[PDB]
């Protein structure tokens, strides 16, 4: 028992972190096979970031201008190319520590672990969620660009995020490993504001199931609701509308606890309308939305 914001073990990803330097800028790169992936803004100066023409900036750059270092050893760069907002540096050595991997573009509401790195060295690991407004609420400082987000299935690492920028609001934006930004963000030091950050309803419900499984049951009530009635409440509180697909994914948790999905929705509804009244749920004084129904099942069953 107990329930924690748990990240995947990061070892398979630590073995892929390298340092990429271009001119005066140093950031993190991801070394998989003979390719090093990193944010394309590694080629920019602080002046360039105001209105960068990446195709023009890359013309003035040769293979020898990209310094790639894995630990204390230098990798020889034999090719370079831009794919959307990432640079792919072909090195002459395949990474011997490359795990089984995939590049996956995640959906909003899905969770992932981040291995924050500086100068190609890992500093920490934490669990994140892709917000419905396509930002992530991470912990990143200058030098953290190129840090990756990922999920692990047995021995396969699914890379889903690469950190590129911090918005003036302190929230984070980045790309998938094909260099496509999540959301409308661009790699330019220009005014970019995030949209409305809605709450991931299906994740809050999954966390309510985790709370019941772990002993915190005070919020269970004698009521039920319908999807349409629940969604009227969800709209008023900037919660994502709950669909039958969401109800379906909550099925294993509903079966385990014996609490119908719509009954748990009625508990959520009263929690939204009345608040916690000074109480906590799984040591939290607010409704947690960064555990998917998969994370709850995984944590409560011990999938390694």
Q: Which residues bind a copy of itself (CB under 8 A)?
A: 1-12, 14-15, 115-119, 121-126, 128, 137-141, 143-144, 166, 170-172, 214-215, 275-276, 278, 280, 283-286, 298-304
Query: Per the residue annotation, which of 16, 22, 41, 80 is the catalytic one?
Result: 41
Among residues 104 and 300, whose Cβ is nearest to a copy of itself?
Answer: 300
Q: Does 164 participate in catalysis according to the annotation? A: no
- 137 contact choice in ligand LSF, a copy of itself, none (CB below 5 to 8 Å, kind-dependent): a copy of itself
Determine which one of 16, 22, 44, 145 is catalytic: 145
What is the C-alpha to C-alpha distance for residues 34 and 209, in angstroms, rounded to an integer? 44
Shortest distance in whole angstroms from residue 142 CB to ligand LSF: 4
* Residue closer to a copy of itself, measured from CB, 59 or 73: 73
Minimum Å gap between C-beta 112 and ligand LSF is 17
Q: What are phi and psi of 181, to 5 degrees?
A: -60, 145
Instruction: Supply 140's token pair.
Output: 């990143």
Each residue 27-66 as x (binds ligand LSF by CB under 6 A) or -, in order, gives --------------x-------x-----------------
Range 163-182, binding ligand LSF (CB under 6 A): 164-168
**Edge-to-edge strand list for the sheet holding 25-32:** 73-75, 66-70, 17-22, 25-32, 35-39, 86-91, 77-83
Long-range contacts of 122-129 (CB under 8 A, 24+ apart): 122/10, 122/13, 122/14, 122/17, 125/7, 125/8, 125/10, 126/5, 126/7, 127/5, 127/6, 127/7, 127/290, 128/161, 128/290, 129/200, 129/203, 129/289, 129/290, 129/292
Query: Which parts of 192-221 interact with ligand LSF (CB under 6 A)?
Result: 192
- Out of 50, 78, 94, 141, point to the residue binding ligand LSF (CB under 6 A): 141
Closer to ligand LSF at the Cβ: 145 or 268? 145
The CA-CA-CA angle for residues 255, 258, 243, to 5°, reads: 60
115 binds, among ligand LSF, a copy of itself, none (CB under 5 to 8 A by kind): a copy of itself
Active site residue 160: no
111 vs 267, which CB is nearer to a copy of itself? 111
Partners of 88 in beta bridges: 37, 81
> Based on CB atoms, which residue is closest to ligand LSF, 142 or 277?
142
Burial class (CB in 10 A: 0-12, 13-18, 19+), 284: middle
Take residue 22 and report the two structure tokens written for it: 């271009």
Neighbour tally for 286: CB within 10 Å: 12
Distance CA 287, CA 281 (A): 8
Where on the chain is the footprint of ligand LSF (CB under 6 A)? 41, 49, 140-142, 144-145, 164-168, 187-189, 192
Residues belonging to the active site: 41, 145
């Amino acid at each position: 028992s107990g329930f924690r914001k748990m990240a995947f073990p990061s070892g398979k990803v630590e073995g892929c972190m390298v340092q990429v330097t271009c001119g005066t800028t140093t950031l993190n790169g991801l070394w998989l096979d003979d390719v090093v992936y990193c944010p394309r803004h590694v080629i920019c100066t602080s002046e360039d970031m105001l209105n960068p023409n990446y195709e023009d900036l890359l013309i003035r750059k040769s293979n020898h201008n990209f310094l790639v270092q894995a630990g204390n050893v230098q990798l020889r760069v034999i090719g370079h190319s831009m794919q959307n907002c990432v640079l792919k540096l072909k090195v002459d050595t395949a990474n011997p520590k490359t795990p089984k991997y995939k590049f996956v573009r995640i959906q909003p509401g899905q969770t992932f672990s981040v291995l924050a790195c500086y100068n190609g060295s890992p500093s920490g690991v934490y669990q994140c969620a892709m917000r419905p407004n396509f930002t992530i609420k991470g912990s990143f400082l200058n030098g953290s660009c190129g840090s990756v987000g990922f999920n692990i299935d047995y021995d396969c690492v699914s890379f889903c995020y690469m950190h590129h920028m911090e918005l003036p609001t302190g929230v984070h934006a980045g790309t998938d490993l094909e260099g496509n930004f999540y959301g409308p963000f661009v790699d330019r030091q220009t005014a970019q504001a995030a949209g409305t950050d809605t709450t991931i309803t299906v994740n809050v419900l999954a966390w309510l199931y985790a709370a019941v499984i772990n002993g915190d049951r005070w919020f269970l009530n004698r009521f039920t609701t319908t999807l349409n009635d629940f969604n009227l409440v969800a709209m008023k509180y900037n919660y994502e509308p709950l669909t039958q697909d969401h109800v379906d994914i909550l099925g294993p948790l509903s079966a385990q606890t014996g609490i119908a999905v719509l009954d748990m929705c009625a508990s959520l509804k009263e929690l939204l309308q009345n608040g916690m009244n000074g109480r906590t749920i799984l040591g939290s004084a607010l409704l947690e939305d960064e555990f998917t129904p998969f994370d709850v099942v995984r944590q409560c069953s011990g999938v390694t």
